[PDB]
Design a protein around this ligand. Structure first.
Ligand SMILES: CN1CN([C@@H]2O[C@H](COP(=O)(O)OP(=O)(O)OP(=O)(O)O)[C@@H](O)[C@H]2O)c2nc(N)[nH]c(=O)c21
Ligand SMILES: O=C(O)/C(Cc1ccccc1[N+](=O)[O-])=N/Nc1nc(-c2ccc(Br)cc2)cs1
Length: 185
């Protein structure tokens, strides 16, 4: 006799394939949804590792009903904690960071503040991979800095590796690299 173990939230995994020829939203696809521990692992164990995705592709894991784009009602006032990897971190760090990030999401690791969490995004880029946790209100300093502190610790980043929180509104009018930060931790 085997019962499934429900998650606190239902989650959706999305795939993105870069193509600057096409409008951004056109490049996004919903893959599938899950709401149990068992189904999370069945999906994770089945699918390609972030380290193996083609340059230009993304995975996003977002709460059911939130599309992984700035436009969504739950993101437009929000922002993201951004982890930028160097080229050598592609191997034997990207996959660890991504799984630890997924587990922060589906395990509701930020306690009461996990409610402010929208999802997480991994960008596979030749320039330097990126992982981010998206939250719903960029002006909620308490929530945002709590999530950032816990997240940085969970990933075991050295203290002197400083990570930044960008508002999506700023990002949409510049670039995630040249975007100035609202917060650091
Ligand atoms: C998250 N993005 C990204 N994006 C478009 O896609 C561009 C590239 O964003 P990105 O893929 O997140 O990062 P990256 O490829 O490393 O490029 P960059 O250095 O400009 O940040 C952005 O400059 C923006 O024009 C978006 N466009 C819309 N309409 N909604 C969105 O949510 C997003
Ligand atoms: O053109 C490609 O390269 C595409 C199709 C695509 C997708 C988005 C936008 C455009 C296009 N396109 O150009 O046709 N790849 N699709 C992929 N799906 C997965 C995938 C992985 C795990 C699970 Br579980 C299910 C699916 C990996 S790559």
């Amino acid at each position: 006799h085997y019962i499934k173990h429900p998650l606190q939230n239902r989650w959706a995994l999305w795939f993105f394939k870069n193509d600057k020829s096409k409008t951004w939203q056109a490049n996004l696809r919903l893959i599938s949804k899950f709401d149990t521990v068992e189904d999370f692992w069945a999906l994770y164990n089945h699918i390609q590792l972030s380290s193996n995705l083609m340059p230009g592709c993304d995975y996003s894991l977002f709460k059911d009903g939130i599309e992984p784009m700035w436009e969504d009602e739950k993101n437009k006032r929000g922002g993201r904690w951004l982890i930028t990897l160097n080229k050598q971190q592609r191997r034997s760090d990207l996959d660890r960071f991504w799984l630890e990030t997924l587990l922060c999401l589906i395990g509701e690791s930020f306690d009461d503040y996990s409610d402010d969490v929208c999802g997480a995004v991994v960008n596979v880029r030749a320039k330097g991979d990126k992982i981010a946790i998206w939250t719903t209100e960029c002006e909620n300093r308490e929530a945002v800095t709590h999530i950032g502190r816990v997240y940085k610790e969970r990933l075991g980043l050295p203290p002197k590796i400083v990570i930044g929180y960008q508002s999506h509104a700023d990002t949409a009018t510049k670039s995630g690299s040249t975007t100035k930060n609202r917060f650091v931790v």
